[PDB]
Design an enzyme around this catalytic site. Structure first.
Site, PDB file in Angstrom:
ATOM      1  N   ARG B  48       1.392   9.598   5.095  1.00 51.71           N
ATOM      2  CA  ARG B  48       2.595   8.796   4.939  1.00 51.71           C
ATOM      3  C   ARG B  48       3.343   8.753   6.263  1.00 51.71           C
ATOM      4  O   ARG B  48       3.902   7.696   6.601  1.00 51.71           O
ATOM      5  CB  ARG B  48       3.537   9.370   3.907  1.00 51.71           C
ATOM      6  CG  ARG B  48       4.534   8.283   3.489  1.00 51.71           C
ATOM      7  CD  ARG B  48       5.395   8.879   2.443  1.00 51.71           C
ATOM      8  NE  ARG B  48       6.560   8.098   2.218  1.00 51.71           N
ATOM      9  CZ  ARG B  48       7.844   8.250   2.067  1.00 51.71           C
ATOM     10  NH1 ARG B  48       8.554   9.322   2.431  1.00 51.71           N
ATOM     11  NH2 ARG B  48       8.468   7.182   1.524  1.00 51.71           N
ATOM     12  N   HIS B  52       4.302   5.169   8.189  1.00 50.33           N
ATOM     13  CA  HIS B  52       5.676   4.779   8.557  1.00 50.33           C
ATOM     14  C   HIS B  52       6.041   4.538   9.989  1.00 50.33           C
ATOM     15  O   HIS B  52       7.161   4.014  10.229  1.00 50.33           O
ATOM     16  CB  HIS B  52       6.731   5.868   8.080  1.00 50.33           C
ATOM     17  CG  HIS B  52       7.073   5.568   6.631  1.00 50.33           C
ATOM     18  ND1 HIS B  52       8.284   5.777   6.056  1.00 50.33           N
ATOM     19  CD2 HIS B  52       6.252   5.091   5.678  1.00 50.33           C
ATOM     20  CE1 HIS B  52       8.218   5.421   4.749  1.00 50.33           C
ATOM     21  NE2 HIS B  52       7.006   4.982   4.523  1.00 50.33           N
ATOM     22  N   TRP B 191       0.282   9.618  -8.729  1.00 55.23           N
ATOM     23  CA  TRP B 191      -0.541   8.472  -9.192  1.00 55.23           C
ATOM     24  C   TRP B 191      -1.737   8.928  -9.969  1.00 55.23           C
ATOM     25  O   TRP B 191      -2.432   8.157 -10.669  1.00 55.23           O
ATOM     26  CB  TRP B 191      -1.019   7.704  -7.913  1.00 55.23           C
ATOM     27  CG  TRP B 191       0.147   6.960  -7.327  1.00 55.23           C
ATOM     28  CD1 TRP B 191       0.613   5.714  -7.673  1.00 55.23           C
ATOM     29  CD2 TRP B 191       0.938   7.424  -6.216  1.00 55.23           C
ATOM     30  NE1 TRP B 191       1.665   5.396  -6.869  1.00 55.23           N
ATOM     31  CE2 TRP B 191       1.919   6.455  -5.998  1.00 55.23           C
ATOM     32  CE3 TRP B 191       0.898   8.545  -5.409  1.00 55.23           C
ATOM     33  CZ2 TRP B 191       2.864   6.581  -4.985  1.00 55.23           C
ATOM     34  CZ3 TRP B 191       1.859   8.669  -4.453  1.00 55.23           C
ATOM     35  CH2 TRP B 191       2.849   7.703  -4.214  1.00 55.23           C
TER      36      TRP B 191
HETATM   37  C1  HEM Z   1       4.174  -1.918  -0.572  1.00 52.50           C
HETATM   38  C2  HEM Z   1       4.048  -0.928   0.287  1.00 52.50           C
HETATM   39  C3  HEM Z   1       4.391   0.545  -0.068  1.00 52.50           C
HETATM   40  C4  HEM Z   1       5.403   1.016  -0.732  1.00 52.50           C
HETATM   41  C5  HEM Z   1       6.612   0.298  -1.416  1.00 52.50           C
HETATM   42  C6  HEM Z   1       5.261   2.479  -0.771  1.00 52.50           C
HETATM   43  C7  HEM Z   1       6.083   3.385  -1.429  1.00 52.50           C
HETATM   44  C8  HEM Z   1       5.937   4.754  -1.534  1.00 52.50           C
HETATM   45  C9  HEM Z   1       6.907   5.662  -2.118  1.00 52.50           C
HETATM   46  C10 HEM Z   1       8.245   5.157  -2.757  1.00 52.50           C
HETATM   47  C11 HEM Z   1       6.402   6.871  -2.036  1.00 52.50           C
HETATM   48  C12 HEM Z   1       6.988   8.268  -2.435  1.00 52.50           C
HETATM   49  C13 HEM Z   1       8.004   8.851  -1.486  1.00 52.50           C
HETATM   50  C14 HEM Z   1       8.465  10.244  -1.788  1.00 52.50           C
HETATM   51  O1  HEM Z   1       9.055  10.555  -2.852  1.00 52.50           O
HETATM   52  O2  HEM Z   1       8.233  11.091  -0.885  1.00 52.50           O
HETATM   53  C15 HEM Z   1       5.133   6.809  -1.335  1.00 52.50           C
HETATM   54  C16 HEM Z   1       4.374   7.913  -1.056  1.00 52.50           C
HETATM   55  C17 HEM Z   1       3.224   7.851  -0.292  1.00 52.50           C
HETATM   56  N1  HEM Z   1       2.762   6.718   0.306  1.00 52.50           N
HETATM   57 FE1  HEM Z   1       3.259   4.768  -0.153  1.00 52.50          FE
HETATM   58  N2  HEM Z   1       4.091   2.836  -0.179  1.00 52.50           N
HETATM   59  C18 HEM Z   1       3.560   1.660   0.319  1.00 52.50           C
HETATM   60  C19 HEM Z   1       2.347   1.616   1.033  1.00 52.50           C
HETATM   61  C20 HEM Z   1       1.645   2.756   1.488  1.00 52.50           C
HETATM   62  C21 HEM Z   1       0.556   2.703   2.436  1.00 52.50           C
HETATM   63  C22 HEM Z   1       0.061   1.388   3.054  1.00 52.50           C
HETATM   64  C23 HEM Z   1       0.111   3.954   2.661  1.00 52.50           C
HETATM   65  C24 HEM Z   1      -0.918   4.495   3.549  1.00 52.50           C
HETATM   66  C25 HEM Z   1      -1.914   4.272   4.300  1.00 52.50           C
HETATM   67  C26 HEM Z   1       0.987   4.847   1.856  1.00 52.50           C
HETATM   68  C27 HEM Z   1       0.842   6.210   1.750  1.00 52.50           C
HETATM   69  C28 HEM Z   1       1.555   7.057   0.919  1.00 52.50           C
HETATM   70  C29 HEM Z   1       1.256   8.470   0.605  1.00 52.50           C
HETATM   71  C30 HEM Z   1      -0.004   9.171   1.166  1.00 52.50           C
HETATM   72  C31 HEM Z   1       2.252   8.912  -0.127  1.00 52.50           C
HETATM   73  C32 HEM Z   1       2.459  10.348  -0.696  1.00 52.50           C
HETATM   74  C33 HEM Z   1       3.392  11.219   0.203  1.00 52.50           C
HETATM   75  C34 HEM Z   1       3.694  12.606  -0.297  1.00 52.50           C
HETATM   76  O3  HEM Z   1       2.903  13.082  -1.137  1.00 52.50           O
HETATM   77  O4  HEM Z   1       4.682  13.172   0.226  1.00 52.50           O
HETATM   78  N3  HEM Z   1       1.930   4.086   1.127  1.00 52.50           N
HETATM   79  N4  HEM Z   1       4.832   5.463  -1.083  1.00 52.50           N
END
Ligand code: HEM
Ligand code: HEM
Lengths: 108, 294
Positions: B48, B52, B191
């Protein structure tokens, strides 16, 4: 044994934290992604009933003893290649001790 | 004037090996501090962070992007859609002190590459050369996505990064990793079941579970499956778009494919905006701890 034996309160949270999403230990307990683990120890790998196992888990047929079990948890895919259990493994002996010990006790 | 040009410049006489060392440090430490977040580890958060720091890119004027390692400035660091990444920043400051020559940009991305490979994902070619840029290059907050939207905001948010439908669906499979934390973002839950190992669970869950929309405690709505998982609006939107949905089915069916598109995309994501002279070294493929006896 060659495998020591540890804290079962610890093993407990490790199991709740790392195995629970996929497995139950209570008797009758329901399979999930993973088989119900009740009466694991002393049974052969791939025997839980009404659970579908990759041929790989069946064809390895090993008796689950605290020892082969610990080699397994270190690295499930090295142990039973083709297995579908999606776990990275426990790289820490205590952890392994702590967990097994817990299991020992929980899957009676 | 045309946009800004960002030439990748290799760190003064460093080479693969110098970079395989950084990986090893990061990799090991992921092996060492495994208690993080109820034993999920630092895997998900580093991937993540990688996303970002790269996701601020704007192809129209070429600003934002991984190049500048600007996440290290407060403005960026403090962007509210960046909540929870401080945990990823801390995890690598140590390693940075160990290797002070590598740029910030090269560290944040190498880190996501390590985490994917270390969690058993595919190999991700990677390149060095990012260069650190003054506090002035810091992108304003707000270039990152909202969760509360649908297929169409998604398709369009991504044309700004220069990604197509297949690349957007592949990238999203990264949602197999970690979970959402209500204190960070208003959503809560994972998820899937293997939060720390890289598979295509994301897509089988999307299509085999039974989702019901509901409100969390933060007062937002999300889709919850009986099995304990959740899906954000933006994830669910992937199966409501006829076009997103056939890529989702491909992938649920064939992991290799997913694995191949993801690697192509993730790297494309990390290199956006950067010009590599024709003299720079071919992208590197690093070895895992497993491949090195560990
Ligand atoms: C429409 C685009 C996206 C949206 C709205 C989005 C939204 C989110 C949100 C709201 C979270 C949780 C945040 C938290 O509580 O820490 C998250 C976690 C995460 N996102 Fe996405 N995301 C998007 C695309 C992606 C993409 C493109 C990747 C990676 C290549 C990604 C990788 C991850 C991962 C690995 C986590 C888990 C982080 C953790 O376990 O702390 N996301 N995402
Ligand atoms: C430390 C954590 C875990 C422990 C101790 C554990 C234990 C076991 C054991 C002993 C087996 C063999 C069952 C038999 O031979 O009858 C097994 C198989 C399996 N487990 Fe795990 N498990 C863990 C984590 C997980 C996780 C996280 C998942 C899913 C994400 C999972 C899913 C499975 C699956 C699907 C199988 C059958 C695999 C196959 O048929 O190849 N387990 N587990």
């Amino acid at each position: 044994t060659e495998f020591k034996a540890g804290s079962a309160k610890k093993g407990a949270t490790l199991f709740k934290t790392r195995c629970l999403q996929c497995h139950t230990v209570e008797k009758g307990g329901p399979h999930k992604v993973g088989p119900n683990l009740h009466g694991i120890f002393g049974r052969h790998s791939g025997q839980a009933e009404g659970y579908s196992y990759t041929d790989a888990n069946i064809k390895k047929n090993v008796l689950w003893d605290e020892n082969n079990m610990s080699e397994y948890l270190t690295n499930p895919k090295k142990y039973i290649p083709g297995t579908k259990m999606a776990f990275g493994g426990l790289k820490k002996e205590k952890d392994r001790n702590d967990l097994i010990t817990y299991l020992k006790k929980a899957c009676e | 004037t045309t946009p800004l040009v960002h030439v990748a410049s290799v760190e003064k006489g460093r080479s693969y090996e110098d970079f395989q060392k950084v990986y090893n440090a990061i990799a090991l430490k992921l092996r060492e501090d495994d208690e993080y977040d109820n034993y999920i580890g630092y895997g998900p958060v580093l991937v993540r962070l990688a996303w970002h720091i790269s996701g601020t890119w704007d192809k129209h004027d070429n600003t934002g992007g991984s190049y500048g390692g600007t996440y290290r400035f407060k403005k960026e660091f403090n962007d509210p859609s960046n909540a929870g990444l401080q945990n990823g920043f801390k995890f690598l400051e140590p390693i940075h002190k160990e290797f002070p020559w590598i740029s910030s940009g090269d560290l944040f991305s190498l880190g996501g590459v390590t985490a994917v490979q270390e969690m058993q994902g595919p190999k991700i070619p990677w390149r060095c050369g990012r260069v650190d840029t003054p506090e002035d290059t810091t992108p304003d907050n707000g270039r990152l996505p909202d969760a509360d939207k649908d297929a169409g905001y998604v398709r369009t948010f991504f044309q700004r990064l220069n990604m197509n439908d297949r690349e957007v669906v592949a990238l999203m499979g990264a949602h197999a990793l970690g979970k959402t934390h209500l204190k960070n973002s208003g959503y809560e839950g994972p998820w899937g079941a293997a939060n720390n190992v890289f598979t295509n669970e994301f897509y089988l869950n999307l299509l085999n579970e039974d989702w019901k929309l509901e409100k969390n405690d933060a007062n937002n709505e999300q889709w919850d499956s009986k099995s304990g998982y959740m899906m954000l609006p933006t994830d669910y939107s992937l199966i409501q778009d006829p076009k997103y949905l056939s890529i989702v089915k491909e992938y649920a069916n064939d992991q290799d494919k997913f694995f191949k598109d993801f690697s192509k995309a993730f790297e494309k994501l990390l290199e956006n905006g950067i010009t590599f002279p024709k003299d720079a070294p071919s992208p590197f493929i690093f070895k895992t701890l497993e491949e090195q006896g560990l």
